[PDB]
Amino acid sequence: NAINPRLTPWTYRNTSFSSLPLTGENPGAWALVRDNSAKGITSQQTTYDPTRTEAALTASTTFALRRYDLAGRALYDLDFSKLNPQTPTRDQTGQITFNPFGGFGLSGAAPQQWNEVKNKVPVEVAQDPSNPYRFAVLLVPRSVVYYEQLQRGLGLPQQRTESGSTTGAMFGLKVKNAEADTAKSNEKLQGAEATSTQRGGGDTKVKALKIEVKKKSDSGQLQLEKNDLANAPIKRSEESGQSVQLKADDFGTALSPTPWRPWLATEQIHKDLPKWSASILILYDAPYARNRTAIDRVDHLDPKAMTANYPPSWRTPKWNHHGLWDWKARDVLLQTTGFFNPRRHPEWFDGGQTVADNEKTGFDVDNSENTKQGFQKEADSDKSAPIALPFEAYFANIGNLTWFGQALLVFGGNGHVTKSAHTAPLSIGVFRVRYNATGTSATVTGWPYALLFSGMVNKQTDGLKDLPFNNNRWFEYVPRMAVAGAKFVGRELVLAGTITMGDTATVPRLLYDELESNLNLVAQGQGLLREDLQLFTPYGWANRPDLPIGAWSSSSSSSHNAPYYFHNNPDWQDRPIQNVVDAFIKPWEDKNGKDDAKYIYPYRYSGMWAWQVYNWSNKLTDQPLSADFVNENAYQPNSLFAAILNPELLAALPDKVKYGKENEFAANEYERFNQKLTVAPTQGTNWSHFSPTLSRFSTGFNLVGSVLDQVLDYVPWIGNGYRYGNNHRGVDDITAPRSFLPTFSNIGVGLKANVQATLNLQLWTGAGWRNDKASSGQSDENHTKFTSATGMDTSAGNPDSLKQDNISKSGDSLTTQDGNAIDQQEATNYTNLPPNLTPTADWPNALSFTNKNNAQRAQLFLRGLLGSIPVLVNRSGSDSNKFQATDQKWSYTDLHSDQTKLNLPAYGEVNGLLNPALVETYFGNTRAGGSGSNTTSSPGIGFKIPEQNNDSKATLITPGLAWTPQDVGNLVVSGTTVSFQLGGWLVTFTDFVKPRAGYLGLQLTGLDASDATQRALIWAPRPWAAFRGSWVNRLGRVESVWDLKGVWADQAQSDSQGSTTTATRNALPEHPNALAFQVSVVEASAYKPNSTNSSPYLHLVKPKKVTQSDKLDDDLKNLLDPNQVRTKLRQSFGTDHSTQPQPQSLKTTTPVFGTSSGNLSSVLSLSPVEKVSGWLVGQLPTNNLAPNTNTGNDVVGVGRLSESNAAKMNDDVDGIVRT
């Protein structure tokens, strides 16, 4: 019985592996086969014990391999549970005894510990490049193949409010402003140093805030005689008696709500390796021999082999290289502490959510004496939770075998094997199995990606510069990947997929008494809102996010402690002229690293998103390991990625990584006050040998950031097929002095700025300009006057009652003025400010006024390919709350006379885009209100500026698509290009191996939402379960396969027909893109103008405190479940012409891309940004779905599937046999 017919093909979800073609000396193929009719493991959910589950799965399932020939016939099967193999014999030279007629010499014994590994199932086969008869098969436990049937979800913290107690917070969020403790009122830092109410003034003197940390030479030693960094005059509030605090029992107690925990710890897997681990076995195969089957050995991929090479700083991930001051600063603000806190990242802790709080850090943080807090503890009852590799993360790291010499590499998979709705298990590193020359012994090791990627610089890429990829010597950046594959394009090892960057969304910190007005950012900081994008709520930020608590309150019992700690306002910043830097910085800047005292200068620092990112993220520089601030890590993969690796070093690295003392957090608080960002590696360590592994990397196009924003506007939304640029007719539109404003570009929007205002050019302002008017009143100026931008008419222009200053030119006397421009001339502030600080601000000549930045452009590119950019809405679109078509205007003729007709919120939405433009792309009200057909079929959702006495109670929502950033296909090669499937888009890195300068660098092909079957695939509740792999044809075109039968099975059963649990129970629905968003409350008086400036966006938009009445409505709280939005949108798409047969599988193929496709040299020979935008609009072509007419086609490489290049099938497919 060679061919078991009860078995049928299948595909392993984690790697898209279905089969392996073979050619040359051993032609044919290998394919996975199983009993596809079994149940697996079997709303009244119950607990499954692991042992009994694995027992029943062994007793009720069957897995094998199937061998084919060059003609496509099945030769035999290999059921490891029923096989009885024999280890093969060798000669004196250790070569496997083989002859093309007799087969292999069988010694008459089984492999070692074979009778305990035989029940594990094969999921991956890779052929040896040095021996076409030697294969490496990967085995996993049976319970891992059916883990998706257990459905163990992540929980929310239990709440006492629902809001739809008080404060209006939803989904369990704890938010409560902090108050000062009158008991510790002495612990405020005094501005001491010297050598004017608007500075340290102790009267009218310029004073810097002095921080001093000193030790006793008397008798964790030195006794820390004084620690200014332990001061805490501001403390967390008390609420119903007991203080508010982030506790791990918020999720329930381990045992109606129960916290999420890993199925098996790292320890249990290490202790039952034969049952619970994953194994590699070597296989010898000759299909035309007498003795054809011989199993050489079996090797285990022990998780501890990886966790033993983790950096030492990963043992206590609740700490960082900022010590105690940052711990208390983040704890008071209701945030998580450390770099990898378990409350944000529970998939890598054996405790799950039973440790998801801020306590037990491995250091003393609540001692009675301020001089004993911050000392690393050796007591073991107070040990922390270390970053580990439990069940789900461990099996997320298993896949993608690759040979090179004697080295067998395991790069990981995308994580769909153990992924849940609101979890994100990922690959943390690489496993290696290295064999000796004879193949008679093997060693197993693993290294984290953090270590292998530790030598990245800026000149190693060709796209965006300054991405948050840097790291430091503590390895606080933990790059995790969703791997597509590792392939050899000639001699180059290419690695590709998506990756987590460092966290930039919560870099800015709010003021301590502004939390209850900025609930969204507080949720992002508590780990409750699993959202990596930057949100636009800049009013309540502090001016800079790196100050200890001692600098927060006041010395005069006033408001916030300006000039040190006040409301962020880039209009109130100083200017970096010589006599100002000499007055405010130079008396002190030469004493910081001196006598153990650092100083905060009375210098006004302020800036928008780009300024915060450029100063407190981990952006890339030209020096490696030079990151001074790693804020946190991302929840999900938020960037496209591709890397080239030196394969010779990967097989030559050490087996065990030796870290030094330069890789640990300091033991006492005096030791880290005298720190250095760089320390040379110590003798007897090799952790610096892993750096040269990366030679080049890519994140997509080869474009400069501002040029990427026209490509992004030319890319359609995969939801309906309308481009994000809204057909905006480039620079020739009416929007300057069927078509709408664009989402990502400024070219043609607003006024034509030729600026010299602050520290020529021919750029634009965009939407939300605040130009002052000129003399007559009709002519417009190129700037905003400081006298207009700062006005007290609490006031959003001057909430902290700042005043002007000036410095008389000798370096001397300060202390007041209106700033006469004669002898005092040099005023501390600016005079002409840029005429924009909205989310669309982009000034190449003023960093403090820019909002768009590369770290956000990469995320917007990825989430725009996934079709899941959150939008801000305050109209539910339902009866009596519809967003009418006349509610929005775009013609600059009307906008110049009134700017609130654009409905730009300028508070609460995503940074970097035009929110009305995204509303127009998603829901299409402007293109709906231009015809009688479909009677405004738009669902009527959107945002409209509030009127006389209405407040805006808005929330962020997702359009409803279910593509995640872990939907990564397998990596295929075709010529000198690499390509893989990413959600619904087939990407192709065309200019990464051999960069052809003057080309875009990428090609995109997506699913066409104007075709019925592809549209059903796009809007499927689980569209990545239908992916069956990609492979290259004979002509050089990449083709993908989809199995649509589950899509039809789900379309046949409606579950969310009338679901209202979102608004009634405040639980997160089981949708992959459900996010615990909050409400943003803005009063109508915020959009009124002030007096030479009539712009509603002159100041920042001040929000309103959130109370138990400021909560959402029910009809709007309903849209927090993406299935309701999905229903409304597909109902707008309403039509019923089902195919019959409703094909069971569909096959897509890339079109033919010419030698002139994606070329920029034809237009790069006006600024290059405007040139590329104009070329795109020249190459650019009333309905709910944009028909794919193929005008947006092979001249750029950005195009969708034609009907002819997407072949449907009649019968479904689980596995694909390729010979």
Author numbering: 60 to 101, 106 to 227, 231 to 261, 272 to 277, 280 to 297, 301 to 336, 349 to 830, 848 to 869, ...
Published text:
P1, together with the P40/P90 polypeptides, forms a transmembrane complex called the “Nap”. In the present work, we report the structures of M. pneumoniae proteins P1 and P40/P90 and of complexes of P40/P90 bound to sialylated oligosaccharides. The structural results reveal that P1 (1627 residues) and P40/P90 (1218 residues) present a similar overall organization and topology in the extracellular regions.
The structure of the ectodomain from P1 was also studied by single-particle analysis using cryo-EM. The structure of P1 consists of a large N-terminal domain, with Asn60 as the first residue visible in the X-ray and the cryo-EM maps, and a smaller C-terminal domain (residues Gly1395–Asp1521). The cryo-EM and X-ray maps of P1 are well defined for most of the N-terminal domain with the residues clearly identifiable, in general, in both maps. However, from residue Pro1388 to the C-end, a region that includes the hinge between domains and the whole C-terminal domain, the density in the cryo-EM map becomes weak, indicating that there are hinge-like movements between domains. These disordered regions, essentially the same in the X-ray and cryo-EM structures, are spread over the N-terminal domain surface. In the crystal structure, the C-terminal domain is anchored by crystal contacts and the density is clear and crisp, while in the top part of the crown, with few crystal contacts, temperature factors are high and chain tracing was difficult. Together the cryo-EM and X-ray maps provide accurate structural information about the whole P1 ectodomain, proving the mobility of domains with respect to one another and confirming the characteristic presence of a large number of disordered loops.
